[PDB]
Amino acid sequence: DIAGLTPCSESKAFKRRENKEVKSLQKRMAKYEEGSAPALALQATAERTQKRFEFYGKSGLLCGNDGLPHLIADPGLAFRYGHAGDIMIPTVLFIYMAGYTGYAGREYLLATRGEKKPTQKEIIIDVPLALKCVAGSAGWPLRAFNDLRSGSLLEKEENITVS
Amino acid sequence: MNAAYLPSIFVPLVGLVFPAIAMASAFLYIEK
């Protein structure tokens, strides 16, 4: 299909790749009589591993010749051809994960800025003031636009330069 | 190749002799 790939469920080497692991695993657990937890621990992993195979085959990942599932970047490809969960969705997740801690770091420096000596306030955090920021940081996309358009996000031209 | 005796003549001259002279003369010119 896409890019000369095939869905991993209808792949073949992928099916080798799944059923070659259990063999090497089970031939190993034949050395432990069931009265041993190692007989159970190995068993539980073989059943744990097969779950993910039926998951990867189902979810529709694309395995190339090797049988290993690949991904696809472009929105116009992921979206239209149906699998965007590889990056396109989690690339939104991350930004909200990263910007949240990103923007929660900016407010704290603002709130702790005006004082007698902000320095000791950076070493020793007052967690309540940091908590009020961790709370306030949520919905940073809407709070970033506003510091952006109100003009309070940038520090403008009093920055220092050299020559 | 018909010239075969040349390398035995040159290589020692260019691997030793010239580096012997260019070692001496280039030295004496460092201090005057």
Binding site: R28, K31, Y32, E33, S36, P38, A41, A44, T45 | -
Partner: protein
Amino acid sequence: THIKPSAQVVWPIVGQEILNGDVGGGFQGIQITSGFFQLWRASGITSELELYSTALGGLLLASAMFFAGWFHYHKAAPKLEWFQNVESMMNHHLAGLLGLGSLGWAG
């Protein structure tokens, strides 16, 4: 002569339980190069109960040291003259630690 030494055991999560090697005695864990097992045989330690008794006793006397550490700085701290006695200190370390500590072990 067969079983290889092992202590550390790896929790199953994150697909890392493969680190547990098939070793011996129906067990899965990391190899040991430290050499505790081949000491504990030479100390005449057989059951697991001797080990718990050292673990606790070792962890108990450890707590006695930090109290000694607290006690000899904050509470009762020797003076300079006390640390200036080498010949006492050397009589004791050489006889007390090494002299008695060898007999005790020779016993």
